[PDB]
Every structure is written in structure tokens, then in C-alpha cells.
RNA sequence: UCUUAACCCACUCGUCUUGAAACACGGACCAAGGAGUCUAGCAAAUGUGCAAGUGUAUAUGAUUCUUUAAACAUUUUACGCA
RNA sequence: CAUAUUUGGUAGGACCCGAGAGGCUUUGAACUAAGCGUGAUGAGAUUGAAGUCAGACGAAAGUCUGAUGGAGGAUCGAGUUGAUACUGACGUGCAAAUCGUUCAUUUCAAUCACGUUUAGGGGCGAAAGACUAAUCGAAAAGCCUAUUAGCUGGUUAUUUUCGAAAGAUCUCUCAGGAUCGCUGGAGUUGAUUAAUAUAAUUUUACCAGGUAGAGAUAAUGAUUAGAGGACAGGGCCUUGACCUAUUCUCAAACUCCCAAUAGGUAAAAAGGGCGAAAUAACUCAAUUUGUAUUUCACUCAUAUUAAAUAAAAUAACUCCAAGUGGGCCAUUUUUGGUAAGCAGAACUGGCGAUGAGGGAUGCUCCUAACGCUUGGAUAAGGUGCCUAAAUAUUCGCUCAUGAGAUCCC
RNA sequence: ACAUCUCCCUAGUGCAGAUCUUGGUGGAAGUAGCAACUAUUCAAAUGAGAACUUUGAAGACUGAAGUGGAGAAGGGUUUCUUGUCAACUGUGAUUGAACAAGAGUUAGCCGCUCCUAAGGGAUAGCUGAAAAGUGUUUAAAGGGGUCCCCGUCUCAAAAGGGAAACAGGUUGAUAUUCCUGUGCCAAUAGUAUUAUGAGUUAGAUGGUAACAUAUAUAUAAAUGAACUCCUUUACAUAGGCUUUACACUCGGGGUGCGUUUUCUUUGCACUUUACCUUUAUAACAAACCUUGGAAUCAAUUUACUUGGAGAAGAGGUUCGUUGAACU
RNA sequence: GGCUUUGUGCUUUGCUACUCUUAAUACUUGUAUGAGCGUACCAACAACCGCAUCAGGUCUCCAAGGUUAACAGCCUCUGGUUAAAUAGAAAAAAGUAGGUAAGGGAAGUCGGCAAAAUAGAUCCGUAACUUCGGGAAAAGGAUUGGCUCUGAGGACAUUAUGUUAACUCAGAACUGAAACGGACAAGGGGAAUCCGACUGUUUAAUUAAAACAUAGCAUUGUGAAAAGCCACAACUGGUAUUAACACAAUGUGAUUUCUGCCCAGUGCUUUGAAUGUCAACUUGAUGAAAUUCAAUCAAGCGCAGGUAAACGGCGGGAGUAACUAUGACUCUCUUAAGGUAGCCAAAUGCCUCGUCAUCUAAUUAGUGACGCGCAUGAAUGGAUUAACGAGAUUCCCACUGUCCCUACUUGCUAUCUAGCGAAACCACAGCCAAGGGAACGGGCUUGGCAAAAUCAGCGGGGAAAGAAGACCCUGUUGAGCUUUACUCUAGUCUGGCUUUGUGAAACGACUUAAGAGGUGCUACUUUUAAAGUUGUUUUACUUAUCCAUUUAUAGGGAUGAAUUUCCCAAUAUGGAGACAUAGCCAGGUGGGGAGUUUGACUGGGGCGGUACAUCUGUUAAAUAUUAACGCAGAUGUCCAAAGACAAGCUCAAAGAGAACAGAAAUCUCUUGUAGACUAAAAGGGGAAAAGCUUGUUUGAUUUCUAUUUUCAGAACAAGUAGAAAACGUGAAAGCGUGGCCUAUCGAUCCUUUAUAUUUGCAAAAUGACGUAAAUUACUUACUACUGUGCAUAUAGAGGUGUCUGAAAAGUUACCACAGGGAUAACUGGCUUGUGGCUGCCAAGCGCUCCUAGCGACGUAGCUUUUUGAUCCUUCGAUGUCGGCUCUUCCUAUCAUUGGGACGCAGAAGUCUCAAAGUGUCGGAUUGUUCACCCGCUAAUAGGGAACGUGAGCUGGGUUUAGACCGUCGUGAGACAGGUUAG
């Protein structure tokens, strides 16, 4: 045989992401003592788009505190954010859309986004278009806080971890019908060599293991172990159940 | 000697092949080069020397020091095989 | 024992040449692939989406209609890029894919450059096992390497001598190998005394047979008929079976009997006779009862002979080694198959490896096997001419509007 | 230079053959052939010799997506002059991109050169026997100010970014480069003289406004440090509209040339004008400002746009095009 | 601020054209202005790449007039050129690029291929059908020149009048060989089916599509640095400048419409205080130690569920409706469920050219139907579709030299000349007929015959050339691909041990006591101790460790700017954590990856068989030998008796008797040569027995030869004759070393247990200071039989049936190589079964009548016009079907001529002879020989020529590689199955 397309994708050659016109890493401002012990006020100067991200970025101007003069940060936009908005970040921040507050100090049933995966990690969860998380409960001792991810997952995280009030911008993005192949080409043009995928069954058996056979059978089970070999694991990995969910 | 004659005879050589003149294969022609060897270890044969022994091994010696890179010698009682 | 040379075995390139491969380390993205970065480039027409304005009709709700407008992986399309078809031209080219004509593509999933990335079981692949420098179902370079080969081809002066096998047995064995056979050399033995050993032979003794043959009334398996009789079926008669004498045909897988041919044993001196004596741990009452052995005798044909016949020692015997292990043809016997120049045998002889003469001709039929020559007389075979010998002799037969002419043919 | 048969050791020792190896050579045969791309002719010159050298006269073709100008890659003296004809120039040949001899490429202003990108190579480290694999990832390493502040390095575009030149002439062959003229650009240390404008008894003014002002040979300087904050550099595609330039055309006058029997108040050529001078002004699409106070909506573009967050109107001002327009 | 100075760069006193700023100049300070490289020419029309002055390839910009929509095509000015590896002369064939054709109009051919028709504008007109957007340039029409006019469309300035510019439109006359998009560019159209929705992409040089991509539908995994998935040797990366509207992995493939059933099997996945099995370690027990044993809470598999838009799949019967029929309805076996919506002789129906319509003149074609469907069917997607197509296919119109049926013509070649000038190829060569021969000869033999030198053509032959046939077969040569072939192995999962520290709690097991249940001072079963010993599960701490973070920028509680609400007020930080992780062991998973195997015989190979080890009879040719996928068979055992010996008896059958066996396994007498019986298997042998019955028994023993069978005269195996022992039986000789005889089976290495007064474990020893003496001791003798464990030697047994003994599956139409006519598919050849053709006979038929015509039941030939049988020829290549074209030969005569016979009235017509002189057609359908129709006809005969005819063509079919559907195959793939493209 010859090493397959999915194995080749991890090589890091042409499959290094098309990050050229992307405008920098979009992760939130770092946690610090100034947010922790107080609040920092900023001004939204601009809303800007990025081809790799599904979410608008927001240009926020903050003032240096250990030095003179004005410093600009790049924040992920929230739906209803606007140019000339005042944005507040910190423990002593008021509750309002696009403010950055520790999740422990959120009312239950709030909708929030840009959640740190663990404390101080800069909005690493809940960041795709139209996404949001909900605060669903607070521990009695106040150490942990219980949140709901848009997958449906429930999770208990530290109270001091930050998040950004409201839902991510550009909601409904995947709900416009894609007209044509040209639209798909442009979407992947700014992403990576992940498209077109090309059917594994169509290939010669030299490549993908769904390949071979004139009459186009798969000819062996397509539900595959979590422990399967890298050149064999093209199937439906570790599937709890398959078929249409009729009832 | 060469040269035609005429009488009688005379089918492409090599080849693998039961069987090749073959409708089997190689060969346009000529020249030069071009293929059972050398070493190791074993065997019988025959020659040759010695004999219940045999083979001087490694090595030492010399008026050995164009030849001499072998030839010569074995202390003024190793080893192989039988 | 040493040594010289040889041949054979065996390791090596091992007689010389011949693969597809397998491994190691490097090198290529100027072609080509996909991506990236920076740039360029795409005559001209056609259609005419939304939005906009206007008009008409409509009691109304509303409806139409005309402009504007300039949308679209929209339309036609030079070009650019390709390359559908003419299975066009070309097909020892202009060319290792050209040329002509046709056709598709042209503002986008567009085309082109330049720069850039990923390298060999590796890349890259809108996927064809595609592409990766005329190279790809595993590149190119060099090395391991003179890889390996029961398989193919080739394998060099002369004369002379002896001269085969194509059966067998075992073999992951049927294109091979090994070991037997058959071959050559080398030696020894004993042969020279017209005989003894000896002999693909007969003689006389002596055997072994169940094939050819022959049989059904001998048995076995068959198998056609009537006749003569003392239980049965049918309707005391008929039909049967059954008995008895008969009767027809049978087998190479049946045998009462039974060949020819082919085959075995036999024909005396290292032995045999008839005797005595010895020896024993066998035997037997019986250490001479037998046995066997031994020592002594006496004596068996043989001047040629223990029946013939034999260029019967050119025999034996031992060694070392070779080639060969696919066979094929004929008569007679013969199995399978409709048959076969088919498949498979038996005995012998050939051919193969071997030819001269005949069979017109011809690998195998017939005659006959060969140093070089001269002469002779023949063989097979012929004798009108081709074509050497008789238009011979002698008795028959034969006329053919497709006569007929010699084994294998 | 050659033999040894008198004897004997030794050998890479005897060829017809391997689609043998290498080299030469025939028959095939003066044959296959010298078949894309419209066409050449006449006379002359040269020279020993001319269908295919040169000149002239005809006829024609390429037909501005050119057999035309310029350039890149790549080639590398092929250029060019003078000779020249052994081989080559698949026919001829005096021809030639062939051969021999020489000559020829000149830059402050044109490129590279400078910068970063997609990228490559290293440092810091860390792995790996080493070879190498990586690239801030446990850093006591480069720069700027007056002890502080920044802070991995380096190569990578001859079509991205980027400081500055044009016109006419000239040689056998180069020219934005030589030459002549006009200019432009980056610089241009220290101290001392001098002139130029400012300010003084330490830092100008105008304009309600948007904003303007140093015209000295020369539009030169309009207080300013640390530390900051901005902006140019600097960007897709499509469609129309509009402005200029170059190009193209028509008509008049002026010069010369052409047709001209007949007809033609005719056909043709020429009628040229650069950068540079904060180019000076004018012009115009926009932007901005004062006044003004709009519905009965108005102003208004091919297109729809705009307006109490102030339109029309009225009066200005600026930017940008342009580049002697217009007193 | 400038000038001056004390005091302490600083400060007080005193003074006031000064302080800035450009440019020029002088003087000093290394020499105080201009770095370095490139710059020719070509850019293909000869300079670049293509081995080369190669019609190929090779990047960018500049862009004139007329015509016109136009930078197209066409001609022209500026600029360029008139050279292309030759010239001349002739003008036929033949070639090639072209033209043109009467009458017909696809009737030729697989195919309308080719060619032509069509095409521009303006004006009209435009359907089925549709997702209402299209279809659409639909279809179908008309017009178009030239000339002379008419009408419409601006700009300026005088108050309705002037001056003045571009051009485009519309209308009317006249005019002409009715001609005008006058060259030029430029669509053929319609009716339908099938497939794919679409734009897109692709086999560089035989492949543009029905394949791929695609939007849409759907699935799976994954919440994050201890995540998914993938890459790396290692450290580490990539996805990731990421974040579930995501990332990754897949499947189906527009719209419209639906997508049934089934979890057994194989997968994937989930639960587990009931659970079977399952390793290293550890723990315990045992032994003197080595050892040997137990025991334990791994994953895993198994059990039990979930899962079919996971892989996939979708039977058989019965019983049953007032006729026959079918069987809704009921029951059933099997299996997991047994084909639902639909759908069809379709690119899918073997049979098949299925049946019915219709289309035609004739329909293996087309279409619509039908549908017990060899073998349709529901995301393996079924059904339907407008738009769309260099798609596959049928038909109709238009058009036509495709064709009837060819003819004429132009260019360029050919041709000839001058000059130049190759190559492939070549045993030797070159006339035939027949024979034989390697069964097809250019040379051979016998015949025909046979006369130079040439010039032009052509493809009959040279089994012409290419090049160690890619077919096929063979190789203990390969390679690619696949699996539940064998053997591994990266990855991965899981356990143990270490790195790896510090504490706490809870829980089980084990030991002893007391109660309860049961048994014979003693022992068993069960409940409670909480005491001891021991294992586990939860947790706190952080120093190991791991991660994150920032310019390491705040001790702790209450669309301006920020620089020289309130109190006390002048481990760098989080997170996880001794678990991770990493290391080392260990089990599992593991075609992802690796290496390798994939018999032989064989009337080709494969399938099939076993003739591969054996035994009988026969073939077998009267000793012996002897084979074939010869024939008739048999074998892999069974037997404490069916072995051994003795003794006794006589069987099968027949008749006659006895209420039961005449007639489910009996009783008696008589007759009874074996007709019974002897385990099986067939043949031999066997009657006071080798049969049957009975008694007593175990020799079915230990040791050893000579040997025989097969045979090399080796083995093994099977035998024979004995011998040394000990016995058994009869006891009496005797007989017994398995089976009445011919058949009933296995080396070495390895394993295992027997056996020994025999041995070894390498400097020594292990019974034993045994037995004696001696004892001032390191005493001295004398002893036949001496540790665990391992090793032997000998003897059996465990097994090799591909049977003188490899640890071994598939596949290649993607393939490579070595060989092969030792071996298939092709001609030829032998043979001629089979096919085809002719006979003879005489029972019948033929009204009567064997024979006018026939001819059964039989029997004899001929042929190679069928197919076999075959494997002699050719495998370092004889080009594998059909058609066309074109010629020749045969006769077995279909017609035509002359006749004979007749069941011949005439007319027809039939059988037939001499006869090959002469002829033997147009089409429909087919890939097709063949076939099957329709029509004409004089009849539309049959055959040969290497299955006549590929350097004659054609390339439609079979038969390379792409692709499609069905069946079959887990799979790769297969399919003398269909289909499209080559």
C-alpha cells in the first residue's frame, strides 16, 4: 500500500493552515491582578472581519498602567457589540453585554461566551459563530460554578475563570443554503487543504481500505475500534449506535 | 598446377531434437580478441624416495649475499599421519 | 609415510554468457503534482434578475403595461487554453505524438509566469495506480555483485582405438538429482597342453504349467427347444412349475481334460565308489548304534572321449571414473478407444549413433553393415526407351467412351 | 633480429559459429530521397566559375495577435569591421550566425545594490552513538537615550515596496551612460568670518470660519527635550458614468512633390515642441465652512442619492486632477 | 539672554547693539563629493531547449487605414520580406490536399462517417413541456443591392427669427438577366428513449465518460495540554493565528418523491457486589537447598444487552373461497428475518430472436406494454424529472457523389534530368506440377520446361521485416494486491515494578473464642466477637513531578485624559499533584506494516478423481517380469477369543413324519463330497477338520540368528526355518514365538516411561568414621553393590495417509522474467465416430400393383461441405471473426440445351442421363457464419482456393488497460454473463 490522505494531512506540508491573511491570534486579554482585584475600562474602536475565524474581532483600546499611553487589544466580538462602546473587564465590572467577568459572579441563566478552558486561558472555549454557554448553577462554597456548553455538555469549573457576556456574533451562519462548489472553494481557500475530501471507496486499494472491488462493496464492517491502526482507522470510530435515529 | 568441359553423383551449415533440406531456430561479409581454469581440502591410479617409521614445522647456522627472493646445513631426540 | 602428475568429487564466478529481483547510501519538483506567495492576462456581441421611475385599468382590494437598471460558477464567441471527431495527413516524420480540418474552453471552482513547499515503499494524487526531468503496479545514481538459475544459447588442431543409454529404484519427484544397469581406462588372476573353467544351443534323463485348444450330457455362471413322467395354477381336461432322459447356443474375468513355443534341474577326479581305522560334549541301550568329520586304503571312463557342438581365456576378478535416466519403428501376440501415422504393452530385431545397392522418390521395408585399391562372381533387384541388361524363350489369360502394372506403399 | 625435434619444465596455447566483443567493409543503390510556409522575372556588377552573392528595374507576399519594434530566461563574442573559402554551410555558393585577424559594452540620476513577504540557514536550548532532528521551547545576547529604556540574529522579490534626468546630436559597432544644452538628487565636519530674514531691550503673525502667511539669486528658520499618539508607505472583483492625454479623422491657409489625352478649384508629404520651473494661473468632479432656514418636499445622477445630526439658495475655502488653459 | 567677577559648573554685584537662522567664504582636522557589479547581440522568421542552421516547444509590453458588431475574416499604408535541405523539364497511371457533377435521395455501410445544407441583421411568428426561472436562435416565415429623395433625433443668439456639428434611425419612388448577409464570416432541424441533475475535474503519448468533485441528505468521534484524529527515530510536531454554527473521520450524491423487514452471523458498542475462562509480578504452602506447587481483584475473550443512512441479507411447505383457478385467511418447518413501496426481457431476463400491440414493405432493431424476476428493489439508495451534455441509442424532415456508377478537372508528388544522397534488410538464394518427407518445398525425385540486358507499375509468394509472443503452459524464478494462510510487528490498550514523597479515614480476607445446624472426649457446617495478622478503597498535604500565564508590573479587607465611592494609608503568580507522566518488564489488540507459503499424478490446465502407501482376481501373451484416470474390487479394522492345545461331533440341503416356524432362527428319522462354514474383502486352502461343540488354558512370552517377500538383492513392514530360556497344553506322540493362507500400516532428531552386580556430570568429597585395630594423631588398615538435579546406554510407545516422514491460503484481463511446440487456443495432417451424400435387399405403403414413385426391419460404402477424437507441425510471433472487393476451380446440376422414364390426357410436374457451355439478384433485421422474412426472377444450386482474400481495406464483434449493472466471491477479485469506451 501507500500511506493515506488522512495520514498525509498530519505531515504539516501543504496541510499547514492558510493563515496568511488572518489578522493574529484572537484569544482574549490575559488574566491579571488588575482584573482580579478591580476592574479595567476599555473602548471599542473598531469591529473587523477575519477569513479563518467565523466570528468578528473587536478592537479595544485600554490604557497602560505601568507605563504611559494607549494600548490596543484584539477581543472576540459578541452579538450587539458596537464601535464606540465602553467595555469593562474585571471582578468589579458591572453586568452588561460584552463585559468580561469571572463566571462565579454570573447570575444563573446568563448567556456567556469566550470561556477559558481552565482559568487564565483567554477565551479558549465557546468562540464559533452564534455560540454561547449558559451558567446553570453555583456551588455553596463558591469554589466551583456549573456551566452548559453548546454541545449540551455540563461542566464544573473554577469560579475565578473568566467569560464574556452575551452570545458570539454572526449567528445563523450555517443556515444560509450553500449554492455551489465555488462557494465551498472560497471557504476552504482561507482555511486549509481539507477539501475536497474524496471518497475512500472510490480510491484504488493501494490507498484507503474502503478501496478496491469492481462492484464497489465495502465488504467489511465500517464501524471501527478506538484502538485501530492509523492506516485502518478511516471508519466510524467507536460508534455507540449507527443507522437513522427513527425512535 | 591452374581452366573450363562432358558423363555420374552431390538438398543451408551449426543447433536443440525420436525425427531438420524444411513452412524449426542462429548466421550480410571479413579481420583480430573470445570459453573446463586456478587455489583449497579429499580419492584412486601410476611414477619416485625411504621404511616401523616418515615428513625439518615454525626456526636457527653460514667466508649465502651480481645469480642467491634458493641453494646448503640442523645445535661443540616438538608436532602430523602410520 | 612423503612427493610428482591425473581424473573425479566439493567449496569458490568454477566452462563462458544470460533474468525478474532483494538490500544499503545518496540525488532530483527546470518536466510533472497539489498547495502556498508576488504579479500579470482574457476582442466583441447576446440575454436582461433585484432595486427604481412612469403609465394604464380597477369604487374597492388590487391587477397589469412601458421604461430605467445592470444581476448571473447566465448565452454565442474570436483569442487563449485544450485536443471530441475525421479510427484525416504522417507512420525509414518536419515531429520518440508533428501537421491539416473539425470541435470544446473565454470573468471565473478562470488561465500564465516567476518565487516557494513536500523526495522513493517516499512525496504529491477533483483517484487514472495518476504523476514524481522521453523514466514508474515502487524513480535515478553508485555499491553489495562476476547475486542466483533443475532453464536458453555458445563451448577452438589432427590421426588411431574401444564405444553407449533413453530400463530400474528412491526423490515437494515427471525439463532434475542420486544410486543400479549398460561404457572406458587401469590392474591383478590364469589361459597357452585343440581341455577344463565356460556357452541366449541342442542330447538324454528329469521336471513345472492350465494359455492356445476343447467342453456343456464334468462342476460355475449362463442358456433355446420339444419329449417322457407324480403335485400346483386355470376351466375330467388343459396350462404350468417339478422331476427324468434329451436338446440348441455360450465365457480369455468358468474348468473334467489339455498342447506347441518358451522355462527349470542333470551329465564324475578339489569329486565319486567300496572298505578299514581314527574324533565326539551330537545321536542311538549301544564314546564303530547311527551321523558327520578325519587318517589310511584299495580304484572310477579319459591314446580321443564319463552326449553333442563351439576363432570356448576376446574368460575371470578388483578398482576408479564417464555418459545415460524424454525414446522411436517393424513383424507376430496384444489392452483401451468408432478409428487413428491415436494411447499403452509383450518377444525379437532395427533405428537412434550407421551405411552401400534396391524399393521412381523416402530415417526404419528388402539385400547388405564400410580401411585404401585392382580384378572376379553374385545379392536384393531387374533386363522397350528414359536407364545398365532380352523388343528373350514358352504356355495360358486379358480390350477397358477414365484397362492394368511389383511387400512396407 | 631470428630458431632449437637434443632434452625438459611452464602456460592467459590452437575458433566458423555465442541475435559473441571490437574495428573495418559490402550487396541493397546513383536507388529511397532532398514534398509544410502562393512567385519570381529581366538587366547589370563582382569573381576563375552565379537559379539560390550584390545592385537596379518590375511583379508580389508579411498585413501591426506582423518574418515589425522593444525586453526576460537561456545562450556568450554568436556582435562589429577587415580579410577570406580547407572543412562545414544535407543543391550551387564568390554567401555565412563557418574560418583567421583585429576592434567594440564608459552611469551620483537606468537596474541590481536597500527593505521586508511567502520563505531558507543558524543562535538560545533540548534530544540524538555520532550523523543529524528541531527553532525561545529551563537565555546572565544586539540596539537607543542620559545609569536607564528598547530587544534572537541573518540571508530570501532584477515584474512587491523603493531617493534621483530629460531633450537633441553623435560612432564601423554603445549610449537615459559619450557629446551639447538644460536640470535634478542625496549628502555637505569642526572652528572662524561674512551676507539673508526672524526674535530681544527671553521663542512671529493673518483669516468669523474651513483655513492661510517667510517669493531671500535660493518660498531658507514660523522655541521646544524625555516619553507618547497617529498617518503615508498600502492593496479584491465587477459594472456603468465622467475628465484628460496619446491615437485617429474631417475642413481652411502656407511650402514642396505627384496625376493631368479627357476629367480633376486635385492626390500626397511637411505644417514639430520634452522633462524641468513649491511649475504660475485658469478649469472641473468631490470634500469643508459662513450665512440661509426648507413639506405643496426640494435639490438631483445614465445609475440613486442627500437633508433639522441643517437641504435648496447665497457667499467662500480646500484637496485632487491637470499642466500656459484663462487676462 | 551675551559680556565681567567674588563667594560656592553653581550664585550675588556691574554692563547691554545683541540672540537665533539659512546660504556663501576662509582656516584647521588622514587625501572632507558622488561606492561596487551589470550594460554586446539573438530572443528563434537559423543564435534558447528538443544529439542538428529540426514546420515542435519557449515568458512580457508597443498596436495604423478601409470593410464590419469587430483588435474576427479579408485587402491596404508605415516597418519587414521575396529565404525556407535543391533546381529545371514534362504532365499518364497512382497518391495526396481539393473542386464539380444528370435522374434518384441513405436504398451503401456496424454507423449519414465524409461532404453538403444551415448561418449576419431588421421585421414577424413561436409548441409540447417546465422546478414558471426557462424551453427559445424552438418550430415557421418574410425581407436585405444600387440610386434620387422624404421624415425623426443637437449646439450656440435674436423674441416668433437666425448662425451652426456629429452621426444614426424610419418611410417613398425609380432602377436591374429578381440580384443583393452577391466575397466575407456564419446553427442543420424535429420526434423520442437511456444515463448522469448542473458549472467543474481527469488516463502527458491508443481512454473525457454513464467515472471523480459538487451542492443537498445523513452518520460517527471529540469539551482540550492526562482531549479527538494524524505526523515524528527520539525530543517533538500538525490540525491550531483553532474551539462543537468547530475540528477530524466517513458514506450517499441537484430538485421532486419515498426510503419496508431482520441484531442470528461478522462488526462496533454498553452493563456487571451473580459470572466461566484468562499473564507477568507478588503472596502463601512444600522441600535441605535448587525446585515443585497453590493463591490473588488486569485488560481481553465469554455470558447479557444496545445498534442495519454498521457489514449485510431478504426461504420452503401444508390447509383454505357456490366451477377450474389463485390462495387474501390459518398453521408450519427452517433460518435472524424470509422481498414491503415500487420497478423491468432496461448499460439488470440464462432460456430468448419470451408474448402482445405499434412503428416497416420485410423489425435478432425502436417504442409502449406484460412480468413465478436463471440472479430487480428501497442512502449498497428505489421511483420520477425540467434545465443541462464534444454523453449512449432509435426514428422522421431537410440536405447531399455515402450509394446506384462512376466521369471530368486544379494543386502538390510521382515521372525525367542536373547536383547531392541514406536506411531497414540480406544462410545461399530465387520458374513451375505432382509425389514422398518433420503428415503444406525456392532448391529434393519424376515430370513441365528453359535465351541476354533491361524501364515503369503491383502486392500473389518469399510460411517478408520488427522483437528471445504480452496468449497458453512449465519454474520448488518473481512482483503487485487480499484474507478468519502461517510467522511476526509499528501503533495502541491494560497490569506490575521503579522514578515516587508526606499523612488521615473507611472496607474485606485470614487466625482464636462464644452461640446456632449437623455428625462419630475428639472432629465437621453456620452466626456473632473486633482482639491480632494481612490485602483493598476513599481522602488530606505539598517538596518530586506535570501544565498554564505574563513587559513574571497590586500583602490584605472596606469615539476626551491619566508620563519628568469607603479603612489601616509617606516559593513570580495560578492550576493539577505524588496520582499522572516517563522508564523497564508483562498480557492483549494489531494485514496499518513486514517476511514468506499457496504439492504431484493429470490423454492441456482447472474442476473432478487418486490410479500418490498398500492387498486380491483379471488384463498378462501356459516359469518369472509387466502398465494405462485398465477392468472387478478391497484397506487404515475387529477378536481374552474369533488367541493356544486336546477331546468329541458333522454341515448346507432334500424327503417323510411331530398342536408350536409348512409360512417370525423348532423337533425326529432317513438321504446327504461340502452344494455349508471358515469376522470383513476377493481368490486360494481346509470334513475322524482349519467347520461346529466342549474341556483345560494365555507362547498375543523373553533372548538370538540363518534368511524369504518388496529389493539396490539397503531399510521398514510382512513372513519362513530354527536355536538359548522359562512355561502352556495333550501328557502320548506332539503342537504352540498370535489370528487357515494371500490384505489390516511408519525413519532420524524430539517427547515419555521401563531396565542395569553397567556409567558420566571433568582438582575433590555427599552410603559410613561401615568394619577392625590403634589414639601423646592431620592414626592406620580393610570393605562388589553411596546425595537432589541433569546427562547417558538399551527397550517400547506418542507421527509423519502428498504414507523413504517441509511448521504453508487466495488472487492478478496492472504485471515482470526464465524457458516451452516436451504443453492449450489457428490452418494443415491422420481418422471420419458425428455431420453430409450414395447404395443393395423387399415387409409394407403406393386404388389393383414389392420396385412409376416409395421403402421399414436390416446391411455396404463414399466424403471431409459439420463437429469431434487428436496433439504429428509451428510458442527468439504463419496476425486471431465478419463484411467488402476481386478472381479462379469443382460438381454432388438449381435453372438454361439435348434427351430417357412416369401413377406422363393436355397443361403442369416428378424421378433421371450426357452435361460446369452460361447464369445464380434488390432489400428489411443481425457483430455474425448461419438464420429469418419481403420483392423481383429463368433459378435466386451446393461447394474448393491456408475456414479464398489485414505490407487489400474495414475494425462492428471475441480478446489489453478506464467505466457500468447483475450474479458469485469475507476479500482481492471471478463470470466461453450482459454493456459503453478504447
Cell of A11: 505531515
* Cβ-based neighbour number of residue A241 at 10 Å: 6
Cα torsion angle, A71, A43, A77, A37, sign? positive
Chain A residues 124 to 143 whose Cβ lies within 7 Å of strand E are 124-131
* Cβ-based neighbour number of residue A238 at 10 Å: 12
- Cited resolution, angstroms: 5.8
Q: Cβ of residue A220 near strand D, that is under 7 Å?
A: no
Please, which positions of strand E sit below 7 A from a protein CB? 198-200, 211-216, 218-225, 228-231, 237-253, 260, 263, 266-270, 306-312, 380-381, 480-484, 490-493, 548-551, 553-554, 556-557, 559-563, 565, 574-576, 588-594, 964-975
In whole angstroms, give the CA distance from residue A80 to residue A97: 8
Q: Return the DSSP state at A105.
A: G
Binding residue positions of A for Mg(2+):
197
Q: Compute the residue count for chain A.
A: 247
Phi and psi based region of residue A219 (left: phi greater than 0; alpha: psi -120 to 50; beta: remaining): left
CA A197 from chain center: how many Å? 22
* A174: phi then psi, degrees, rounded to nearest 5: -85, 5
Sequence-separated (6 or more) residues with CB below 8 Å from residue A206: A1, A2
Sequence-separated (6 or more) residues with CB below 8 Å from residue A222: A210, A235, A236
Query: Which residues partner with A215 through β-bridges?
Result: none
Cα torsion angle, A221, A226, A228, A232, sign? positive
Burial class of A84 by CB neighbour count within 10 A (0 to 12, 13 to 18, 19+): exposed
Closest CA to A163 of A108, A104, A109: A104
Residue A179 near residue A186 (C-beta atoms within 8 A): no
Cα torsion angle, A70, A71, A72, A75, sign? negative
Q: Return the DSSP state at A29.
A: P
Residue A105 near residue A58 (C-beta atoms within 8 A): no
Distance in Å from the first CA to the final CA of chain A: 42
Q: Note the CA–C1' distance, A113 to B33, in angstroms.
A: 92
Q: Please, which contacts does A14-19 make with residues 24 or more away whose CB atoms are closer than 8 Å?
A: A14/A193, A15/A192, A15/A193, A16/A192, A17/A52, A17/A191, A17/A192, A18/A52, A18/A189, A18/A190, A18/A191, A18/A192, A19/A52
Please name the helix (run of DSSP H) or strand (run of DSSP E) that holds residue A188, with its range, or none: helix A181-189
Phi and psi based region of residue A198 (left: phi greater than 0; alpha: psi -120 to 50; beta: remaining): left
Please name the helix (run of DSSP H) or strand (run of DSSP E) that holds residue A110, with its range, or none: none
In whole angstroms, give the CA distance from residue A209 to residue A224: 12
In whole angstroms, give the CA distance from residue A121 to residue A25: 13
Task: Starting at the earlier edge strand, list the strands of the sheet with A57-63.
Answer: A70-76, A57-63, A39-48, A86-90, A100-102, A162-165, A111-113, A133-138, A144-148, A154-158
Chain A residues 9 to 68 whose Cβ lies within 7 Å of strand C are 11, 13-15, 18, 20-21
Q: Cβ of residue A193 near strand C, that is under 7 Å?
A: yes
Closest CA to A63 of A89, A83, A82, A37: A89
Please name the helix (run of DSSP H) or strand (run of DSSP E) that holds residue A183, with its range, or none: helix A181-189
In whole angstroms, give the CA distance from residue A90 to residue A38: 6
Binding residue positions of A:
197
Q: What angle do CA A94, A95, A99 make, to 5 degrees?
A: 85
Residue labelled with grid coordinates 475563570: A161
In whole angstroms, give the CA distance from residue A134 to residue A201: 42
The CB-side HSE value for A165 (13 A sphere, CA atoms) comes to: 22
Q: Cβ of residue A179 near strand E, that is under 7 Å?
A: yes
Residue A80 near residue A172 (C-beta atoms within 8 A): no
Chain A residues 67 to 86 whose Cβ lies within 7 Å of strand D are 67-72
In whole angstroms, give the CA distance from residue A37 to residue A108: 23
Amino acid at each position: 500500500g501507500r500511506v493515506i490522505r488522512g495520514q498525509r494531512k498530519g505531515r504539516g506540508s501543504i496541510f499547514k493552515s492558510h493563515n496568511h491573511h488572518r489578522k493574529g491570534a484572537a484569544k482574549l486579554r490575559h488574566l491579571d491582578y488588575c482584573e482580579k482585584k478591580g476592574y479595567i475600562k476599555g473602548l471599542v474602536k473598531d469591529i473587523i472581519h477575519d477569513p479563518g475565524r467565523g466570528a468578528p474581532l473587536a478592537k479595544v483600546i485600554f490604557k497602560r498602567t505601568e507605563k504611559y499611553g494607549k494600548k490596543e487589544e484584539l477581543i472576540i466580538a459578541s452579538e450587539g457589540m458596537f464601535t464606540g462602546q465602553y467595555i469593562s473587564c474585571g471582578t468589579k465590572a458591572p453586568l452588561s453585554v460584552g463585559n468580561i467577568l469571572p463566571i462565579g459572579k454570573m447570575p444563573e441563566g446568563t448567556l456567556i461566551c469566550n470561556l477559558e478552558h481552565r482559568t487564565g486561558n483567554r477565551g479558549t472555549l465557546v468562540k464559533a459563530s452564534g455560540c454561547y454557554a449558559t451558567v446553570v448553577g453555583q456551588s455553596e462554597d463558591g469554589k466551583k460554578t456549573k456551566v452548559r456548553l453548546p454541545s449540551g455538555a455540563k461542566k464544573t469549573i473554577d469560579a475565578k475563570a473568566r467569560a464574556m457576556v452575551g452570545v458570539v456574533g454572526a449567528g445563523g451562519r450555517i443556515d444560509k443554503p450553500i449554492l455551489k462548489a465555488g462557494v465551498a472553494h472560497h471557504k476552504y481557500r482561507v482555511k486549509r487543504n481539507c477539501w475536497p475530501k474524496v471518497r475512500g471507496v472510490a480510491m484504488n486499494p493501494v490507498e484507503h481500505p474502503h478501496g478496491g472491488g469492481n462492484h464497489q462493496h465495502i465488504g467489511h464492517p465500517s464501524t471501527v475500534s478506538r484502538s485501530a491502526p492509523a492506516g485502518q482507522k478511516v471508519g466510524l470510530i467507536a460508534a455507540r449506535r449507527t443507522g437513522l435515529l427513527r425512535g
